[PDB]
Amino acid sequence: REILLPEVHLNSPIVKHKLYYYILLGNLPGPLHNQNWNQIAHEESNLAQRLVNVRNFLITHIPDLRKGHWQEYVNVILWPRILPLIPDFKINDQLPLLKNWDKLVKESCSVINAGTSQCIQNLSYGLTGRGNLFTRDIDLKTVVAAWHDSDWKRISDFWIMIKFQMRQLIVRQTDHLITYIENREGIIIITPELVALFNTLTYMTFEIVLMVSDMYEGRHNILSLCTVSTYLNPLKKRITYLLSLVDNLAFQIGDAVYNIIALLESFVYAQLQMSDPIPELRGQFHAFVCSEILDALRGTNSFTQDELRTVTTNLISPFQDLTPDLTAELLCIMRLWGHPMLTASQAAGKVRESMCAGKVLDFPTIMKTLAFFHTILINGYRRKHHGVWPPLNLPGNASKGLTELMNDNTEISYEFTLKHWKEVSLIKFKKCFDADAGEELSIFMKDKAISAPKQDWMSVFRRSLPNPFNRRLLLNFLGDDKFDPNVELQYVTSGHDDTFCASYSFAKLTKRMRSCQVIAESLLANHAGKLMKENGVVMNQLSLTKSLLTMSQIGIISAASFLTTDLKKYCLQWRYQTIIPFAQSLNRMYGYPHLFEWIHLRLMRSTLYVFNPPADTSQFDLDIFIVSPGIEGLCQKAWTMISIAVIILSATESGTRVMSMVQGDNQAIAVTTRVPRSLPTLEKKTIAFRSCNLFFERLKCNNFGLGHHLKEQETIISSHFFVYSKRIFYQGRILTQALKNASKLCLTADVLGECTQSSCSNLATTVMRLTENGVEKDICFYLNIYMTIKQLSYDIIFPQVSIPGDQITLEYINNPHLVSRLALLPSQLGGLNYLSCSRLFNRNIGDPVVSAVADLKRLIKSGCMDYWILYNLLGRKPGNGSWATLAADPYSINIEYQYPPTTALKRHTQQALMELSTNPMLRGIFSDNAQAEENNLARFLLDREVIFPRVAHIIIEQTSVGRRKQIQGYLDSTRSIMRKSLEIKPLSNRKLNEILDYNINYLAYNLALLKNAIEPPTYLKAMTLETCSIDIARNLRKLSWAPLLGGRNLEGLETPDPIEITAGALIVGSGYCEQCFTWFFLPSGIEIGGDPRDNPPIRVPYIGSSSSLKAVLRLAGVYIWAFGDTLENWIDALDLSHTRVNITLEQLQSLTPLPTSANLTHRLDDGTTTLKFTPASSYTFSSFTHISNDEQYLTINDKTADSNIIYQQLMITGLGILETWNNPPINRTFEESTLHLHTGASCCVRPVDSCILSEALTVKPHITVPYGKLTLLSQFTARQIINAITISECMYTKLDELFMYCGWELLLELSYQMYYLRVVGWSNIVDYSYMILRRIPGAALNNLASTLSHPKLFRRAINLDIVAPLASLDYIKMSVDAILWGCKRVINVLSNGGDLELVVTDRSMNLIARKLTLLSLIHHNGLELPKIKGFSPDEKCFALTEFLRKVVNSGLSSIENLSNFMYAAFASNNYYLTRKLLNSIRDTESGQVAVTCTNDYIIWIIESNANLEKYPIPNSPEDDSNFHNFKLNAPSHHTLRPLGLSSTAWYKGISCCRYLERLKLPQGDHLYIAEGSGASMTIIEYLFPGRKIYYNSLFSSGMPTQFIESVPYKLWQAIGMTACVEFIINRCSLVHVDLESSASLNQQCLSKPIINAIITATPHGVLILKYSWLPFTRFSTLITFLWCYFERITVLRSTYSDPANHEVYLITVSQATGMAMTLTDQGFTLISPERINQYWDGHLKQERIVAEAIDKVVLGENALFNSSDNELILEPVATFIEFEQLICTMLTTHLKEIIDITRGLLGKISTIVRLLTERILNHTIRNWLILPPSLRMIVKQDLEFGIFRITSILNSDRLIAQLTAGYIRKLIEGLTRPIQKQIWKALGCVVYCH
Amino acid sequence: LKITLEQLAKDCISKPKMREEYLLKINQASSEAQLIDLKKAIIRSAI
Ligand SMILES: [Zn+2]
């Protein structure tokens, strides 16, 4: 009762010692002991008393107290399962509380029922409309019913009540009798140690009840989740038949079934060994496992053959007609039957059998393996360095070793090694190498187990005829004196001393020995462990998962040879005599003698053990007990290393591309070959199988050679059957290992620190982990709801420390409404709903708070029948908190109860632990007033105008108190050390009062969130009527943090929430969406069954994509903000530096040069402290996906993960939506389907801000302990770019020199590679350059998207004649051919000229650079004599000298420069110079000037009734997704229609009018379909005859404007799918239509074509249709559809399109016939075979003509003789010459205003800054014709991408108004599509007016 | 084992009568090499 009631879920072994000891201590109906009972009954037990009252009570209540044969009186402890199944307590008068349980949960579920369904249905309408598909009904009622209409439930509730009674009893025992309970046909004996069951009677000890409760609740939850239609009756029948048969067999036999239980898990693999292509594997593994389980059963006399065969059939019957996922789930639940009860005999005997099995030492294999280990170590040390690998040996054999060593060969081949023995032994006794010891304070500050010295048995237990120790390394270690690894390693190199007694329980040792163990493990795994090859095990999650998934992927083509094994004896099999070579090698490598082997060494001379049958025994006894075998988990690091060694040796023995993972003892290996990749895939699997089979046999031979009983029962091979860490991979997927998590749906929290909150959190994450795989999301939402409800119920009724005192209990339980109203708000903003909705589609978070309020708003708008609650929580009492309280966490809302006692108790734990201290200089690391210092820093950081949480967070994390915080945080926090810390008992009673009744007051607070509270009227309406989650979160955080911080609202975060912003819509077959940005596409692709090569797409998977001086550097960089650079803030940084920097001589330099500028964006992330993370992820269908962002979301900018975060969130969202669309058992049944995320109608976009300030409170922490021309632009850009292949900013103010110099550098590198291999000047250079360039598309894709983009950059290059763009709309080739031209031009340079004075990014590499240059120079410049290669440093330098002195007599160019050939600029870092110099050119400079309508026609598509289809060539570029570049943004041409309009389109109209007058036509009626908002159509009538148009518009959620401004008075002088088109045809000459949509392989607007048909029917008037070939396939499909009943179709290119693909304008019996015609003609039909090239050259002509038009509009000319023709029907502010002085005055006044101001709600200044700049932009726009032409072209570039670099930069200098703000420069240097187009057309109007 | 290959057959071949007869014989067949032979016969007997 006093604190921390004991465990509620077992983590201790279940034994037979204890239960038998109890029951035989009592007098109740051959063990390993028969000693005495009366003496021990006297021996202070009280257990005898308890159990004898149990006995005599049973006697008075059994009829058969002492009879003949115990008629129905059986002490069945032989693990009965059908007997607990038996209605032991099924007296249907249920305990009264549980009826209330049922009533409450059912009624709450009913009241909350109707809202949530329509809630999620509306959420679906928001995404696409009727989501959650499967090919019945789902609802909350079904879930709750199934969970309360299922079996195994009542028994689980009974056992939970049992557990609760027993916890109450043991709590009583802690405080201080037992419980006797009578009832009809049954007896309830409840002791704090045993419970009785009888209606056939048995006993159960404590741990047993935990086991059975877990078992029953688990199977309950399993069949519950199975009840849902997703994974239906198949799995139900499976689990029920299996459970039944296994329980019956366990009854029939006993413990043996437990054994086969293990052997049963491996059995499903056998079925999943249905690798149907490759044979022999079925009959291999299925037969093996079946036969072995046959043995394991028949070994215990059930029956020989008949029973055996029948039980085997009935046991495998739950395994048929199941694809992998279901079978894997079936396994993960097949483990649900609890563990066996333990006893020393069996396990002790097995690990004893790990004794002598044959001293079979094989010197050849161990020597070869030591050699390969040396080689791997050497090559790794070479790679993870610039490289020395300095061995002080090898005098033995190899002069080849001599060469490849003295040259410092950075590579050492394995095949080279295999042909040698005894490669190297760095064996000495002198010094150390590449290692050091006494660091990484984590290891020996974290504790492990510990044994006792010689006198042990007494300390292990009593009952002999002697003292206990019960210490832990943590206690004494903290209380240790003068300790250090060095003294520890001295003990290591010291004694055979009789002070280590290996114990086992997975084993322990003594204090000093274990300390040496952890030290050694740290040293190896830190220094050597870094050296890694054939394993993606570097990090925890990203590399590990991606590596496993990708080895599975490369196994898949569009390699099928995998195997794996899991081994245990690999620990207890090793031998000293077979590991000491590695020992001494790595020993001398780390210098410190005899370090890496001593432990195992000592295990040769000693005895060990795991109660004990005595006669008189206390010392060394030849054998319970074991004498000197291998050990379980000690130094397995080296085990894994030698494992890698043997695997690589096997790989080299039989050459094959091998990739593996190996850790502990388990491993898995994939292998692939150079198979011809065209023939059918089956015999491909055959060849792969033969290869891996030879490999596996050789591996088995060698592995046994080293000595390893590796057998078949540990290994499994197949084609696509990877396994690791109980997660299996199959056919390139993570299997839906979901149902196991299902069984982990517990009913309470972790063992320590009981509290409701954390419980639900765990629960939440569990079900959220469930969300990751398999089961759909709606069931997960509903299940989280039900789980939270039922959990809060179980907590409120019979609380675990039940007391009926407070009335909060009754006020909660009396109404079901309240518990629903409390389980339906996002936990971050109070409540027990820990982010299951938003997180439902992204493991990343961004901010939860905005997500919390978004969830809230969405719920209420959908309706949980609580609206006032928002106002209540807004007006809720602002909590207290504290400065440091907020400091320690961003994303925070000051509420009373947001931290369970777990964190509080653990914090006080580590604190009171630090209190124990006699250690080294760690003293200052623990101080008394640290909290005062944290609050002082908080005051220093947050008491200012503009405030940001994350900066304070990181800045306190990195400062001096950062290390103290982290150190004191990463202690040990296990129950054991928890009690051992509570050994510091006086925490408080006040604090104890706080802890022991937490949940009471939390529920009381949420009770204060009862029925509606007072509502503040102002802010209510100021914030009600939901507008945006963003603003609600803003106002809430502000108002709730007011009590401390007051007015100022904090900002710097809160990117929005997905479900609010993005809505989108899918399209299948025929479909329309919202009027248009981004789009996900999915082709019609099947799962396995055809051919992976025939699986239509290419599988492109996508997922969520020198000292702590580093820390002080990040500190400064984030703190100064890199732009506000005063003496004050930098002095602050220096003071923080003196604060944290305690490592070397403290950093006293003036101004930190080395720290770079990184304040631009908020890229702050934290993690990566562990080694692995087991529950990785799940995704099964985002492989055939095809993402594409070619629609506007972003331009060239400096975002760098600013909006890429929300971009990434949109990617995840689309992937998840589509996955959920096809998550269950699926097939090709879905046709080509897309998702379009039209997200323009988002409630809030909330543009970004930027300003400066200074904090000033001058507080200091205190501790001092240990811990001219700019071709340089092209040069550095070529460096940074070509270095990647090995962004178009900084590539905007450039020319062809970039490509010139990148080609030059590439030539340098590749030519150095050429090593005299003949490459002639032009021919072979071109050849090998192509051969090396047309590879590795990734970085090429990058460079493409980066430079070849929409802006004039492509136009600039193509006008400079750099490339040649000639369906043919490709981009990537151009890019690489770009480099081509460079190289070509480069060669011309080397034809004559030795300029450009190469730069180095020390002296060795630049000498080598000169070497590269001379090498290429001669490689072309020879042609008279060859040359030889030799030494590295100067051989080719003297080659230069000699060959130059020769060719000086035979040359082609001028002679003088050849002399100058005799005769290196410097650099330090690319980032520094690149960025600082690109921002250095940002002054007044005009060097960039170096670069300084009836013209669109027809294509006249096809002739009348024409049927000669030609070579299709439907080839399409952009096969892989670069960044968005095809048609985004070229807003230039908008200036070509200056009107007073908004459409400006009808320029295309007059073009089509020209076309019309180019031919005859019928009478005029002017059909205008569904488009027009004051648009083109007018012109037609304005130029062609008609009366009373026939016109309509699309159904618009709200009548043409301009057309009614044009025609109607001149007349008065004298959307459709099926029905709208019908009304249209109800109301026959020309018609006009125009639309556009997203990707699809069919047509969806044929309605208007058939409309034209039937309307010209009601006679050959010609139409007008807008369309464009972005997907030329679809264009041709529409063209093929037209080529049926129509003839002489013509299409005409426009000049309103930007330079890009045009928006070109086109002029059988049934329609379905032509539809199917063209659709099936996807196969072999395309009808645009030749004129496409003419189209293309015409589009190039047009790009040139519009460039000329831009040139014209830079002047005062026009594009006249049609502007007036349109004006036939159809910002004046003052202009001045000194608008420069105007700008000066305006900036002066506005900056004075800014100084003045600083001296629902709003920001501060960003709005007025942007408004000022915009007004200045408009002024310059109006005054365009006042023009200093230099500035005119400058602003032309700017407003064309480089937007608005302020003009009067420094001339604005003309004191007080400047002295008040010195950051005017940054103010000077601080573009959206729509306003861009607006200002272009405004400039056009300006030029047309005057 | 016998029943394992019976299951393999049941899940491999098409004609229920031929399946029945191959089963009738494999329960009588007792030569492990001949079991492998009948197994390959089953696999290649999918036609
Ligand atoms: Zn919004």
UniProtKB/Swiss-Prot annotation, chain A:
Reactions mediated catalytically: RNA(n) + a ribonucleoside 5'-triphosphate = RNA(n+1) + diphosphate; a 5'-end (5'-triphosphoguanosine)-adenylyl-adenylyl-cytidylyl-adenosine in mRNA + 2 S-adenosyl-L-methionine = a 5'-end (N(7)-methyl 5'-triphosphoguanosine)-(2'-O-methyladenylyl)-adenylyl-cytidylyl-adenosine in mRNA + 2 S-adenosyl-L-homocysteine + H(+); a 5'-end (5'-triphosphoguanosine)-adenylyl-adenylyl-cytidylyl-adenosine in mRNA + S-adenosyl-L-methionine = a 5'-end (5'-triphosphoguanosine)-(2'-O-methyladenylyl)-adenylyl-cytidylyl-adenosine in mRNA + S-adenosyl-L-homocysteine + H(+); a 5'-end triphospho-adenylyl-adenylyl-cytidylyl-adenosine in mRNA + GDP + H(+) = a 5'-end (5'-triphosphoguanosine)-adenylyl-adenylyl-cytidylyl-adenosine in mRNA + diphosphate
Protein family (similarity comment): Belongs to the paramyxovirus L protein family.
A Pfam family hit: Mononeg_RNA_pol
Name under which the protein is recorded: RNA-directed RNA polymerase L
Residues reported to bind ATP: 1567-1576
Entry GO MF terms: ATP binding; GTPase activity; mRNA 5'-cap (guanine-N7-)-methyltransferase activity; RNA-directed RNA polymerase activity
Location of this chain's protein in the cell: Virion; Host cytoplasm
GO cellular component, one term: host cell cytoplasm
Residues in Mononegavirus-type SAM-dependent 2'-O-MTase domain copies: 1537-1707
EC number of the protein: 2.7.7.48, 3.6.1.-, 2.7.7.88, 2.1.1.375
Lineage, top ranks: Viruses, Riboviria, Orthornavirae, Negarnaviricota, Haploviricotina
Subunit structure: Interacts with the P protein.
RdRp catalytic domain residues: 559-732
InterPro entries assigned to the protein according to its UniProt record, in alphabetical order: L_poly_C (IPR039736), Mononeg_mRNAcap (IPR026890), Mononeg_RNA_pol_cat (IPR014023), Mononega_L_MeTrfase (IPR025786), RNA-dir_pol_paramyxovirus (IPR016269)
Keywords in alphabetical order: ATP-binding, Host cytoplasm, Hydrolase, Methyltransferase, mRNA capping, mRNA processing, Multifunctional enzyme, Nucleotide-binding, Nucleotidyltransferase, RNA-directed RNA polymerase, S-adenosyl-L-methionine, Transferase, Viral RNA replication, Virion
Keyword Hydrolase attributed: yes
From Swiss-Prot, chain B:
Top-rank taxon, per record: Viruses
Similarity field: Belongs to the rubulavirus/avulavirus P protein family.
Record remark: domains: The N-terminus consists of a long intrinsically disordered tail. The central part contains the coiled-coil multimerization domain (PMD). Forms a four-stranded coiled coil structure. The C-terminus constitutes the alpha-helical domain that binds to the nucleocapsid (N-RNA complex).
Subunit architecture: Homotetramer. Interacts (via multimerization domain) with polymerase L; this interaction forms the polymerase L-P complex. Interacts (via N-terminus) with N0 (via Ncore); this interaction allows P to chaperon N0 to avoid N polymerization before encapsidation. Interacts (via C-terminus) with N-RNA template; this interaction positions the polymerase on the template for both transcription and replication.
Function: Essential cofactor of the RNA polymerase L that plays a central role in the transcription and replication by forming the polymerase complex with RNA polymerase L and recruiting L to the genomic N-RNA template for RNA synthesis. Also plays a central role in the encapsidation of nascent RNA chains by forming the encapsidation complex with the nucleocapsid protein N (N-P complex). Acts as a chaperone for newly synthesized free N protein, so-called N0, allowing encapsidation of nascent RNA chains during replication.
Protein's recorded name: Phosphoprotein
Residue range from the parent sequence: 346 to 392 of 392
